[PDB]
């Protein structure tokens, strides 16, 4: 299930495409926070799928201080809390021997600050979508099984459309009204 689409559409929907695990092949035409210790970052990455960096005495930076509430929420062990507060004491001593720390302690604050949205409660299928690749290259026009069109234009889209319409058995979809991105996402969901 391989689809061809205008380049601006994939450019605008790259985030959703990455979130739904479809690989992107496109041709162009012309401060973060860190966790005190690696264990908490690993736990939060496992829970939410969000990559988190680790503080390594680099520069005056902004530190995230996970609080007792989220410590209990994430199921963190006693040793993790102990090492977190040990690193906290080390930071206290370092800044007393003359960096900003935030004691985030609500789940919504952490979500609205950084990271990916939590997981829904449905059965997990083998794959999120039935499509593997959406591309905008003439080099793999024979690779495609269907294509999508929009009133928006690309300098190479006309030739690709001509070379794709020549296929004997290919599914063709066109969008005329509403939002192009919403229609494309609905199509990629139902295809």
């Amino acid at each position: 299930a391989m689809l061809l689409a205008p380049g601006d559409v994939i450019k605008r929907s790259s985030e959703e495409l990455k979130q739904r695990q479809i690989q992107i092949n496109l041709i162009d035409w012309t401060g973060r926070w860190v966790v005190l210790t690696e264990e908490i970052a690993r736990a939060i990455e496992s829970k939410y799928g969000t990559k988190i960096d680790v503080y390594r005495d680099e520069v005056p930076a902004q530190i995230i201080e996970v609080e007792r509430s989220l410590q209990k929420e994430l199921g963190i062990s006693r040793e993790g809390v102990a090492e977190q507060t040990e690193r906290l004491r080390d930071l206290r001593r370092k800044e007393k021997s003359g960096i900003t720390i935030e004691g985030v302690m609500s789940q919504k604050k952490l979500l609205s600050m950084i990271g990916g949205v939590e997981r829904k409660m449905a059965p997990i299928g083998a794959r999120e979508s039935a499509v593997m690749l959406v591309s905008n290259s003439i080099k793999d026009v024979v690779r495609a099984t269907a294509y999508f069109t929009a009133p928006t234009g690309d300098p190479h889209w006309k030739e690709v459309a001509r070379e794709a319409s020549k296929k004997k058995n290919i599914l063709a979809y066109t969008s005329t009204g509403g939002d192009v991105k919403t229609e494309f996402l609905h199509l990629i969901d139902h295809l």
């Binding site: 695990q21 264990e39 690993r42 736990a43 496992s46 829970k47 799928g49 062990s77 006693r78 040793e79 993790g80 997981r119 059965p123 997990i124 299928g125 083998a126 794959r127 999120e128 979508s129 039935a130």
Partner: protein, 856 residues
């Protein structure tokens, strides 16, 4: 990330070769490129044994002499085939038999041709063949011929009318021509094969191809299925489709080659994809140690070595009984106990260990059982109830509040409990298959391969016995997180085994698959340990590789390029094997037929001679892996019919006459004169053609010839009477004949006094020498002999006495052949040679073959 048929094949060769190179002898490497082998075999399959021509090759040519009324007729067949093969020597039988094989190959090569679209012209409303279609070369003698003979020649040309004849319910043009007997025999055999095939063979082959396409989910164009029913097309079936698999499997010790070719020819290409990122990393319910892993990631990218190991795991999974895993521990690569302790968990789900077949050795079963025992007893974040059994074996305990005995999870190959083959019907037979030797249907976890699935929703809420029991046991022990993780991963597991089952049942069906009888005996042989058949290949694997394999899947992107054209390759391979077998049989029979003159040799000699001439692609295919096994294979009665075999047997039958090969032993010696013409009336001498040859019209009369051999000559030389006896015989103008050694004959044409070496050469050589105090002597016979023809050219200038030497010049060697090589005939019978019947297809007619339709 990506995989393909050829790439996995190369990896398999590398692994097997590295395993086998560990032990070698005699203290005396390369991995062949499967791409080159596949390309060569496909090209060989695309080759045509026959060839289509508009005009047959010239059979008779004429050399014009000074005479206006006489001319010589030369048979082109004999004058050219003498250059086929090198010289013969009696010390090396292998080269002699290689020359014999080349000579018999040449006849079959020359005799296979088809006439089509002959150029003709109309005359008086009747079609008359043009002067080039008939196989003569009389144009060179025309300019000297007189008017009245030339008119007869023209009238004979006018008589070459063309008639019509019906062949296979089709009208073809029939006419008369000239050709040599050995070539005409092969031409007639080819024609008869063409008529014979049209009855039933083609329809059966097309039906079998249709059935194979039906099973393997292959759709063929109408040009392959219904194009043979046209009335304007002849299909010459050089290769027959329903090949019996016994021919392929009868070659000794070829299991590795068969498995490699099976992987290479029909394995689809695809990618390895991680599971849905909606499944988080598994968290272990263990009390925290300061350096242990809290969780084991699933999206992490493995190293190249781990990629090779997971490739090994998948390759052995896709071939149930032929490839087996084995653990390997590196001295370094420091690993936490958790990864091994959870690989021991996943091993009981990835593999089956009994019932019908096995994917793992007993050592792996014991190691996995020990790892599971350690996981179940030694891991706990809180106190857990446990009970112990009396016997001293792993997994003799009962764990949890409920009395869940873990004895069932101990591996037992006799019943296969605790693994995938737990109370499931893994093997079943439903209907006859396109290949009669492989009727079994494999089904992992009871999943049926007859129904298509969708990856998005398949596998939700469906379980098999082993997985359900393992989940119940795991949740009973109090490991909630691991149980939840394994429950979440179930649809991915089901989809992966669905894909694997589809690949095994649909694509890998070929002759190269292991037959049912050998497949059934794999497990009992491993249990008993009395290995007599080919042993299964064992591969090494690490602990982390089990986890990585459980956290990856194989998705076929698209089918193999050569999947559609496999049967033709299989048929051509079987046909070549059959041809080599029949060549060996005919060589043995020929050697037995004439022991007096043929050099005695061992089978390893002429088998090597045959292999020297076999196509390189077949040799490369068969050499991817004694004498007793060779004889056993030769004595087998299974043969594969083919056009090449049909022509080869006729060529071997025609090879029964050594004169057709121009190898002779009737070499005589007799002192004779070079003729000295009168040359008194030069015009009269020029009008009457004159020539001199070494040929004998008839063999010398009996009782006028003496018979010699090696031992007679040695006895004569023992007293010094050899040369004396020869001189006495020559002074008595008697004949002498040599024997034993088979000689080769060469034909040459001269126009003046020949070079001396052939003028006064001797077919034998004599020498003597002395070492120490004893006298010594040697005798030998020349193996190369020449036959020359002399044409005497005269001009008005020379005197009659010019061509009369003062003293005689003597020639010794003479040769007798019982067939006409060069004949002196008058211009009347130039076209009298036309006595053989030819059939030619019309220009609008089409010749087609199956390989052409598939566009090889």
């Amino acid at each position: 990330s990506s995989d393909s048929g050829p790439l996995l094949s190369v990896f398999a060769l590398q692994e097997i070769m590295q395993k086998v190179r560990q032990v070698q002898a005699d203290y005396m490497f390369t991995v062949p490129d499967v791409q080159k082998i596949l390309d060569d075999i496909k090209a060989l399959a695309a080759e045509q044994v026959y060839k289509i021509v508009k005009v047959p090759s010239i059979s008779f040519r004429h050399i014009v002499m000074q005479s206006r009324d006489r001319v010589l007729r030369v048979d082109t067949y004999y004058e050219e085939m003498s250059q086929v093969g090198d010289v013969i020597t009696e010390d090396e039988p292998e080269k002699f038999y290689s020359t014999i094989i080349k000579k018999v190959r040449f006849i079959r090569g020359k005799g296979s041709f088809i006439l089509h679209d002959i150029p003709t012209r109309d005359h008086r409303g009747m079609e008359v063949a043009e002067p080039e279609v008939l196989g003569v070369e009389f144009k060179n003698v025309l300019p000297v011929l007189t008017a009245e003979h030339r008119a007869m020649i023209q009238n004979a040309l006018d008589g070459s009318i063309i008639e019509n004849g019906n062949v296979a319910t089709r009208d073809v043009d029939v006419f008369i021509g000239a050709c040599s007997e050995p070539v005409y025999r092969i031409y007639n055999r080819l024609q008869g094969y063409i008529e014979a095939v049209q009855l039933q063979e083609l329809r059966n082959s097309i039906g079998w191809l249709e059935r194979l396409g039906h099973r393997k989910r292959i759709t063929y164009s109408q040009e392959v299925l219904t194009d043979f029913r046209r009335q304007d097309t002849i299909w010459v079936l050089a290769l027959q489709l329903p090949v019996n698999p016994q021919v392929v499997w009868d070659v000794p010790r070829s299991s590795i080659a068969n498995l490699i070719m099976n992987i290479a020819t029909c394995l689809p290409t695809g990618e390895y994809i991680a599971p849905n990122p909606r499944i988080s990393s598994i968290t272990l319910t263990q009390r925290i140690t300061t350096t242990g892993p809290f969780a084991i990631l699933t999206g992490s990218t493995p190293t190249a070595q781990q990629l090779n190991d997971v490739r090994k795991i998948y390759l052995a999974l896709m071939f149930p009984g032929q490839i087996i895993l084995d653990l390997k521990i590196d001295p370094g690569e420091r690993m936490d106990p958790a990864v091994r302790m959870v690989a021991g968990v996943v091993g009981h789900l990835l593999f089956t260990a009994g019932g019908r077949f096995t994917n793992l050795t007993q050592n792996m079963a014991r190691q996995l059982d020990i790892a599971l025992n350690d996981y179940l007893l030694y891991m706990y974040n809180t106190r857990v109830q446990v009970n112990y059994g009396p016997t001293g074996e792993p997994l003799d305990f009962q764990i949890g509040r409920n009395q869940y005995d873990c004895n069932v999870f101990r591996a037992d190959f006799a019943t296969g409990t605790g693994y995938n083959g737990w109370a499931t019907i893994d093997v079943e037979y439903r209907e006859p298959a396109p290949y009669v030797h492989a009727q079994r249907y494999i089904r992992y976890c009871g999943i049926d391969s007859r129904e298509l699935i969708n990856p998005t929703t398949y596998g939700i809420g469906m379980t098999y016995h082993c997985y359900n029991e393992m989940l119940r046991m795991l949740v009973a022990a109090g490991k909630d997180s691991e149980a939840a993780y394994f429950r979440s991963m179930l649809p991915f597991h089901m989809v992966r085994f669905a894909r694997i089952n589809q690949i095994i049942n649909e694509d890998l069906h070929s002759v190269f698959s292991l037959p049912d009888d050998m497949f059934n005996a794999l497990l009992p042989d491993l249990i008993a340990g009395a290995h007599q058949n080919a042993d299964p290949v064992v591969l090494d694997v690490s602990w982390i590789s089990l986890w990585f394999a459980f956290n990856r899947s194989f998705e076929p992107t698209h089918r193999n390029e050569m999947l559609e054209v496999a049967p033709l390759i299989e048929s051509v391979y079987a046909s070549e094997l059959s041809v080599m077998k029949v060549d060996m049989r005919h060589l043995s029979l020929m050697q037995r037929r004439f022991p007096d003159v043929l050099i005695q040799a061992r089978p390893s000699h002429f088998w090597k001679a045959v292999l020297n001439d076999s196509p390189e692609a077949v040799k490369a295919v068969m050499n991817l892996s004694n004498i007793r096994d060779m004889m056993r294979w030769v004595m087998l009665p299974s043969l594969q019919p083919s056009l090449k075999l049909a022509l080869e047997e006729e060529a071997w039958a025609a090879a029964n006459d050594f004169e057709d090969l121009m190898l002779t032993d009737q070499v005589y010696m007799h002192r004779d004169m070079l003729p000295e013409p009168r040359l008194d009336d030069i015009e009269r001498f020029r009008q009457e053609g004159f020539y001199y040859t070494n040929m004998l019209e008839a063999p010398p009369e009996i009782d006028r010839v003496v018979q010699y051999t090696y031992e007679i000559a040695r006895l004569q030389a023992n007293m010094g009477q050899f040369r004396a006896a020869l001189r006495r015989i020559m002074d008595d103008d008697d004949w002498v004949r040599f024997g034993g050694v088979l000689r080769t004959v060469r034909v040459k044409f001269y126009d003046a006094r020949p070079p001396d070496d052939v003028l006064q050469g001797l077919p034998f050589s004599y020498d003597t020498n002395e070492r120490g105090g004893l006298a010594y002597a040697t005798i030998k016979y020349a193996t190369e002999t020449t036959i020359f023809y002399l044409i005497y050219n005269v001009e008005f200038s020379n005197t009659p006495d010019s061509l009369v030497l003062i003293n005689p010049t003597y020639t010794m060697t003479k040769v007798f052949i019982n067939k006409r090589i060069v004949e002196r005939v008058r211009v009347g019978q130039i076209l009298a040679v036309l006595n053989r019947r030819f059939v030619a297809y019309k220009g609008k007619m089409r010749i087609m073959d199956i390989t052409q339709s598939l566009k090889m």
